[PDB]
Amino acid sequence: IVEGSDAEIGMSPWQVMLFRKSPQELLCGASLISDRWVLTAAHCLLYPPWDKNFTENDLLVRIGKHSRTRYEANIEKISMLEKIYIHPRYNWRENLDRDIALMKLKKPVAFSDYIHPVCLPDRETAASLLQAGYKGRVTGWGNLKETWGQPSVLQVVNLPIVERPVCKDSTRIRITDNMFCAGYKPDEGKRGDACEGDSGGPFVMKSPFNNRWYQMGIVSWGEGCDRDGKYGFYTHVFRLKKWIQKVIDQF
Amino acid sequence: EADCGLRPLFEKKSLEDKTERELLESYID
Ligand SMILES: *C[C@@](*)(O)[C@H](CCCNC(N)=[NH2+])NC(=O)[C@@H]1CCCN1C(=O)[C@H](N)Cc1ccccc1
Ligand SMILES: *[C@@H]1O[C@H](CO)[C@@H](O)[C@H](O)[C@H]1NC(C)=O
Ligand code: NA
Asked: Which residues form the active site (chain A)?
């Protein structure tokens, strides 16, 4: 996360950390949607261009963490993966269209003051909240600047959703209806962006009607980080809700 | 929706985090 700040403890209890077992490595962010299901970006698990194709046994997820590194004994929870489900139409070849994956944990996690699921949007939420100009919130332990350091505490940044034509004209990469972009425009007085390593993390919004947080997007891709005239791209969670439901109902 | 999206240390305790107001005000601006 670039130009964000340290999160308050328990501010994002659905935050999940995707960890490679060997060598030990922080791969991406993810989010808790139930006691057995974690949502993340497909490219965090499968990306052939980078010779990346992790299987269940190669990974572990960490839930309830605040610091990056510090062992938060009996607060954080480490879970094994029972199964990985990547969207069948995930386009790793061209533009990361449908950059989404689900991970089912071997055992249900116990919720706590630091571990709690986020809501997934329904039609009404998507229609009312995913509008240009409204701000959402992105969190992650990814890069603090465009590079190639890393934060010691989870970072958070609030960013406004950008009009689709502007997202489209800001890049030569083909954008789709399964993505949305966010970030401030040049000279608006504020900056900020997700960055490498933040993928899989949630872009959430708080409903003004019921006080609940909904995960509207998944950090997916960008070009550089926090560059003027460029915007971060996110997987449009509601556009892919039907697939999410299908997997959870079927397993 | 059960209990989804209501944070034990914030919504459940009627406490606002430091910047959520920025998000709510953005629905206007
Ligand atoms: C995997 C995620 O950690 C990372 C998030 C980047 C977010 N950046 C900003 N500014 N918000 N995603 C990536 O690194 C993805 C994976 C494939 C390459 N990639 C990119 O973002 C490239 N920089 C651009 C791109 C290349 C190919 C296909 C789509 C996008
Ligand atoms: C990743 O590996 C698994 C088995 O090791 C294989 O079934 C799968 O096709 C691979 N992913 C791709 C599409 O390269
Ligand atoms: Na920018």
From this structure: 43 (charge relay system), 99 (charge relay system), 199 (charge relay system)
